[PDB]
Amino acid sequence: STQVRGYDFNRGVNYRALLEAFGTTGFQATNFGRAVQQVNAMIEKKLEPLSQDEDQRRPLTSCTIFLGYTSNLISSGIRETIRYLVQHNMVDVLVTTAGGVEEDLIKCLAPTYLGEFGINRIGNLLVPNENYCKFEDWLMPILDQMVMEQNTEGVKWTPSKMIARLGKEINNPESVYYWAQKNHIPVFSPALTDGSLGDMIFFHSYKNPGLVLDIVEDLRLINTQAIFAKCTGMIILGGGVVKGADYAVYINTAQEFDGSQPVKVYADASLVFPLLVAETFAQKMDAFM
Amino acid sequence: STQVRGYDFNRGVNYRALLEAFGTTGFQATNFGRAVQQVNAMIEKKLEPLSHADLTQSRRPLTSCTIFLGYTSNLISSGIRETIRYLVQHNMVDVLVTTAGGVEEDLIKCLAPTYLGEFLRENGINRIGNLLVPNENYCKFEDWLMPILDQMVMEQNTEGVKWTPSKMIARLGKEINNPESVYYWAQKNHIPVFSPALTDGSLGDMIFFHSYKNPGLVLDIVEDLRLINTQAIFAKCTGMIILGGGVVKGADYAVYINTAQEFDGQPVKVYADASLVFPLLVAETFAQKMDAF
Amino acid sequence: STQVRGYDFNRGVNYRALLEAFGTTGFQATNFGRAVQQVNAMIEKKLEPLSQDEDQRRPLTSCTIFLGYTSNLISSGIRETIRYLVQHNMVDVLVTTAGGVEEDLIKCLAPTYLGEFGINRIGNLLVPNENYCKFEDWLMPILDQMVMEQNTEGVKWTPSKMIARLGKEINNPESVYYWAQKNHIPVFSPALTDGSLGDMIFFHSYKNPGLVLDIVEDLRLINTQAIFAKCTGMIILGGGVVKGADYAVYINTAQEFDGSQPVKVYADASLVFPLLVAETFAQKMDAFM
Amino acid sequence: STQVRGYDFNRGVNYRALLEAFGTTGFQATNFGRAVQQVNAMIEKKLEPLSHADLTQSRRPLTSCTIFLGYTSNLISSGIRETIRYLVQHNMVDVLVTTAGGVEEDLIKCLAPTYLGEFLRENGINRIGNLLVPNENYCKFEDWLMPILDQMVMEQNTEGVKWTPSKMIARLGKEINNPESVYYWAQKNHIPVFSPALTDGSLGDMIFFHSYKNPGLVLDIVEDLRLINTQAIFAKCTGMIILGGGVVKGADYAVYINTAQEFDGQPVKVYADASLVFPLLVAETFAQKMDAF
Numbered sequence A, C: 001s002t003q004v005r006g007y008d009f010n011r012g013v014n015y016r017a018l019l020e021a022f023g024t025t026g027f028q029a030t031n032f033g034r035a036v037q038q039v040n041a042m043i044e045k046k047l048e049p050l051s052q053d054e055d056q057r058r059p060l061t062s063c064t065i066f067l068g069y070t071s072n073l074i075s076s077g078i079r080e081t082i083r084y085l086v087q088h089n090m091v092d093v094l095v096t097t098a099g100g101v102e103e104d105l106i107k108c109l110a111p112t113y114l115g116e117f118g119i120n121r122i123g124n125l126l127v128p129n130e131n132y133c134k135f136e137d138w139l140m141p142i143l144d145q146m147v148m149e150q151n152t153e154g155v156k157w158t159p160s161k162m163i164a165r166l167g168k169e170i171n172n173p174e175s176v177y178y179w180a181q182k183n184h185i186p187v188f189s190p191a192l193t194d195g196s197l198g199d200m201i202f203f204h205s206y207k208n209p210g211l212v213l214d215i216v217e218d219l220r221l222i223n224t225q226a227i228f229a230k231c232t233g234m235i236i237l238g239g240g241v242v243k244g245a246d247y248a249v250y251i252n253t254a255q256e257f258d259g260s261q262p263v264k265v266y267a268d269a270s271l272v273f274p275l276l277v278a279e280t281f282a283q284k285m286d287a288f289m
Numbered sequence B, D: 001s002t003q004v005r006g007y008d009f010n011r012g013v014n015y016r017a018l019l020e021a022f023g024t025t026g027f028q029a030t031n032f033g034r035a036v037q038q039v040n041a042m043i044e045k046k047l048e049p050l051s052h053a054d055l056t057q058s059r060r061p062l063t064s065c066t067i068f069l070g071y072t073s074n075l076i077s078s079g080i081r082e083t084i085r086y087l088v089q090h091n092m093v094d095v096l097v098t099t100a101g102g103v104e105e106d107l108i109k110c111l112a113p114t115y116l117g118e119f120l121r122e123n124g125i126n127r128i129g130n131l132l133v134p135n136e137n138y139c140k141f142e143d144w145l146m147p148i149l150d151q152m153v154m155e156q157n158t159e160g161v162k163w164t165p166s167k168m169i170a171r172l173g174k175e176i177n178n179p180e181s182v183y184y185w186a187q188k189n190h191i192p193v194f195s196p197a198l199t200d201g202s203l204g205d206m207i208f209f210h211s212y213k214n215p216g217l218v219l220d221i222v223e224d225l226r227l228i229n230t231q232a233i234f235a236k237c238t239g240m241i242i243l244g245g246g247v248v249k250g251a252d253y254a255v256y257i258n259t260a261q262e263f264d265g266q267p268v269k270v271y272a273d274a275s276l277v278f279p280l281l282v283a284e285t286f287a288q289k290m291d292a293f
Ligand SMILES: CC(C)C[C@H](CN)N1CCc2c(-c3cccnc3)csc2C1=O
Pocket: A066, A095, A188, A189, A190, A215, A216, A218, A219, A222, A223, A226, A241, A242, A243, B199, B200, B201, B202, B204, B205
């Protein structure tokens, strides 16, 4: 067995040794260590070529990695972390919750600010209401195009296809969804219209009615990704995002007690996720380039 | 300024008095008291006489307060399913909103029971906290569901039905035809149910597999988006009672009951397991006014 | 096995049936049900006469019940709940944390108020600073008497003996510690001087030095209570209070994940404890009178 | 107003830059950044030159900032024991405060290791979260401890020593005589340790049993009360770093790191497991200034 032992700062500030020593530190530090091993196993599996027997828009690899996250993390600076992974094709499918799309898009038009625990407060973050007004103006012409394409070109819209379209339109390398569509990484979000984006789609529908967003074609798409995977890796940030995974890491502060080798790290992902990425995907950056 | 004071058991045990004294006990007990006041205000507003079905596209008549009841699926797996069913049965709320699993966990309880365990896969058991759902429950549900999905596809392609999650949930409640079901009562009383995440869990798995045996089902969320937002927009007053987190995204009255934290990102929040608190809340509010409904 | 089933309000508001139905409701409601059974088992054991073989200031019963609680609950209205139990000899030993003594005593001099989440805020409670000034005035002459008794009568003070003395002095039936000393229920609290009471003892010690509070005699006293018990019941509210129990109920919101048939109810005790007492000790009130 | 922005890994991996970017990431990452600023301010104040041992009754010289380091015993069972030991070893803090178990869990690690398990009684194992302490560790500690307690009683009754928890902790650290021990370094560097709850756990069990074999030990808390309060009162400036809850009851700088909640009842709180956060905090603060100490 492994002895409990924390990093000894008499050795100086050796950051890599420090991060490795979380594994033997105990409690959630140990879980962070296990999360690093689990994600490195997904990456190692993913970079392993498909054998001649295992062969199949996005090409299949030896490990399909699903990255899920709640909207709050897209409001946070973890948006940059997720965008980096998507940009370099390190994950294959994104899943998110109400708000998780528009909050990325809105940051390309106006910044989010730090406050404290016309303003939309999200934890200690501040989104001025003018951000959402700018977003409305940008969005409306796109929605007119989408309804026209539905009615005159037989386009059958789903949340994922809509998200891809919004990513193409924002046309900005800081956007998670710009990179997702450019790299053919599908984004699933049945709760896409539950928040502000949904409010705008709602008002738009009275000037220009009939937009259909089907979730059943998306249901087929996401499940086929899971079913045809050689191996599956899950990285889920925050709770309430998804409902067998060969590798899995969950990072959230949800409790089990009210009913709400897989690894759970009980921590705010805003602290843990960048450290996790530093020791995993960022070490194998060239292999993905 | 109210003094802190707890119920004195030298009075004996009067449960009404015990529950009222939560108000002056402090911490979440006080929030519970504030939640009772807030829900009672909703009810009183709902009951006071009103002195556009085209705009709402709904058959349910407007009252002076539209109450939205939101809840996570785990609460339906629990006995809070009975609490919710009762409110729905007697038309005490106007709109339901739930999360992935929140529909099928109710319907499956009509076919077979959920059991109490403790805080599995080789025996075929889906654990939800200290609750146990045998996998055979889901198999029974699947068999029940398939022919209904067949009818739904046929009605869509030949009777022009445009399905959405809410219309599906209504159909499933009518089909289950069982007075213990939330969704049976909801459709009977024209209380719509919204759940964009309807297909994220087991029910979705079954719909997915069904779609290869019988392709064609479309579930539109935009028509539901209009229905739920028109309910809010054309309300005279709105009340919100939301159990667990992540259900909904101005409300004149609002009560939230959950144990989610604020730190990783007058409305009343009670920081508590709704399985304890919600039946106490119902007892001191809706259940006191049963006659008026 | 037991089927999950919540209370059905079509039966009307039958409070006792409602409380019983928590047992089959699931999650923490089920734990509340288990807590009720566990505490009723302690009480039943306690009211059972000592057999002729089992015989021993406080007389031993068939079950010694330890009631522990954090200071915050004494600031809350749960102070009334605890006081009721102590008043009628339903528990045998109290254990508490820093502040848990003085907050009871101070309420006999001035009230605590409700605020929101010169004022000492405790959660959503408010203690005006003038409360602590009144307490200081009341306390100083008592501390002079205590030092005199130590030096001229050989009194060897410990936290428990001090707490008993303060309870006798407050001489008020609303006080937990008045009833504890009257009924010979010892109160243990090594952290007695960590807060405001300690601040006053500290300043007092420069006008009138030499007060000794020994924790070792208390160590012996509390452990002997545990060792000589026929049966032991633990009821612990909040975390960090104590460190084999035949019956045990813990009510707190502490998590396991950072390392901080016994039953744990994960809930604010301000909600749960009065309901627990209603269905347990309060049902057997006459047997204790 | 600072814009929300996370570390961009297109820069590659610079750990200093990564940790600085926590400040602008939001939620607890931002609090971490604020914690680094706050601790760095303490250190800078401590290091700036000072231009009453009678009143404190202490041998440790005053600096321009007295830093109190508080921590719960579970952190000593973890590897954070090493982090704390390092700070104590290099005199970077002035006063330690801990909770029941916080002394013996350090001393026992000098006799035998704590192991990693997972989140027992028949094998003889005390589980602390995902940590495992074999019961034999406590037996070894007991045997080591008894003759020291004998000496302590004799010194009390014949050399007039007036024992308190802090003086006991110092004696135990001197006896363990091992540079991996927090308490060894604390006594060597005249950093006092306060723990009124010293006897609530295993160490107390042993003291209790010892007291029948060799009666007479007195542990006074009032003399410790004076010592700790005089440290605070005669500080030029005070800094507080408190890990886990329930340790202490004006501070010029204060950082708290724990996962306790406010709901059942500029200082910086980081809502996080200190096993993750504290080594990162130390890396960006005290460990950057090692030379100055
Ligand atoms: C972990 C994944 C690979 C599998 C599970 C299977 N129950 N699954 C699939 C369906 C689904 C959706 C969904 C539904 C409809 C449209 N778009 C998105 C969102 S989360 C989720 C989900 O968990």
